[PDB]
Ligand binder design. Structure first.
Ligand SMILES: O=C1N=NC(=O)c2cc(OCC3CCCCC3)ccc21
Lengths: 195, 198
C-alpha cells in the first residue's frame, strides 16, 4: 500500500530518492526547515522509500486511531544525527537501545529544526556536512516525562497497562516528544546541510 | 487477519481463553512442557488473543519470509516471568527495556528457551505469594541466527563491510541452540500462558 508521491522502485523495497529543487515536495520540506534554520545551507533533500518500515508504521497508526477513537495522532518532527548513524536509520528507523535522556529512555524528536541543528545532535562530519531527518511520529495522547521512564506512564494507575502514547517536556507548549516503541516513527526525508 | 479458531471477542481487542484438558490444543502444550518439566503440575493453560500484538507480529513474519530465502523463520519457545510482569506481557508483549541481565549473557535483549525446564527455574518463573509459577509459550521470529556476545544491543551484521544487513536473532550455540535473544518489538507473540505449581 505504498504512497502515490513515492516514485517507482523497479520492484525493490528500499530506495533513497533525491528531490528536485523548486518542485512542490522539495519546497514544502525546505520551508519546514527554513522556519527556524534560514541561516543554514541545504545541499540536498532525499525521500526515504522504505516499504517494510512504512508497513509497520501504518499498522501502528491504524491501531492508535482505533484505540484513541480519533485520527489526530501524527506530528511531523525533526531528528539530528551523526553521519555514522544515517545508514542504520534509513534501513531500520529509530532505536531507543542506541546525549541526555532526562524525559525517559526513548527516541527524542524536536518541534523546531533549530534544536536538532545543534552540533551535539547533527554532528558535522569530516567534510562539515550535518544530517537531520523529517519524521512522521505517532505522538497520540501525551503527558510530561521524567528521568528513568522505560515506557510512557499510565493514563490512570487504576489500570496500569493503558499507557500514554508518548511524553513531552511541556504539555501546554511542547518542544520535544519521546517515543518508547519501534515503528512509532517513520523517517520520511533526510536533509543534508551546512552552517 | 484474526485466526478463525479464536473465540468471538465481540468488538474487544483482547481476551484470555481457558483451555480444556483432552482438547488437542491443551494436550500439545502440556506435552511440550512435560518433556522437560515432569516434576511440576499445570494448574491451567490460557490462549492469549491480543489483536494488535498479532497484527504487528504477522507483518514482521511476512517481511522476514520475503527477505529470507525459504527459511522456517518461526520457533515455538518458552519464557518464564514473575506475576508482576504478566498483565504488561499479556497486553504489550516482550519489552527488551525491561529485561534482566541473564546469568550467561549473549546480548541485551529478551531471552527465550528451547526447553521449559530452563524457563521453570525460580530465577525466571518466580513463585508468587500463592506458590504459582508463570511461563509463556511464544511464537518467536528466530530467522537466520549466529552465536551472540554480551556487548550486543542489536543482532550483529552478517558481513562486517555491510554493517546494516543484520542477523535476525542470536543464540548460545549455533549447532545445539538452547536459548535465543531478540532485540526488536513485535518479533515475539505471547501465544499461551501456563500457570503451574510444585
Ligand atoms: O534531534 C535530536 N536528535 N537526537 C537527540 O537525542 C535529540 C534530543 C533532544 O532533546 C533532548 C532533551 C533536551 C532538553 C533536556 C533533556 C534532553 C532533541 C533533539 C534531538
Amino acid at each position: 500500500n505504498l504512497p502515490e508521491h513515492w516514485t517507482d522502485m523497479n520492484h525493490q523495497l528500499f530506495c533513497m530518492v533525491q528531490l528536485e529543487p523548486g518542485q512542490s515536495e522539495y519546497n514544502t520540506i525546505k520551508d519546514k526547515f527554513t522556519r527556524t534554520c534560514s541561516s543554514y545551507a541545504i545541499e540536498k533533500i532525499e525521500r526515504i522509500q522504505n516499504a517494510f518500515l512504512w508497513q509497520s508504521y501504518q499498522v501502528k497508526k491504524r491501531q492508535m486511531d482505533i484505540k484513541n477513537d480519533h485520527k489526530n495522532n501524527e506530528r511531523l518532527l525533526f531528528h539530528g544525527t551523526d553521519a555514522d548513524s544515517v545508514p542504520y536509520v534509513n534501513q531500520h528507523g529509530f532505536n531507543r537501545s542506541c546525549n541526555a535522556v532526562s524525559y525517559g529512555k526513548g527516541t527524542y524528536f524536536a518541534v523546531d529544526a533549530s534544536y536538532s541543528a545543534k552540533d551535539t545532535y547533527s554532528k558535522p562530519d569530516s567534510n562539515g556536512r550535518k544530517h537531520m531527518y523529517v519524521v512522521r511520529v505517532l505522538t497520540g495522547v501525551f503527558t510530561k516525562g521524567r528521568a528513568g521512564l522505560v515506557t510512557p506512564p499510565p493514563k490512570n494507575p487504576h489500570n496500569p497497562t493503558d499507557l500514554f502514547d508518548s511524553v513531552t517536556n511541556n504539555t501546554r507548549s511542547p518542544k520535544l516528544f519521546v517515543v518508547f516503541f519501534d515503528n512509532q516513527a517513520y523517517p520520511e526525508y533526510l536533509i543534508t546541510f551546512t552552517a
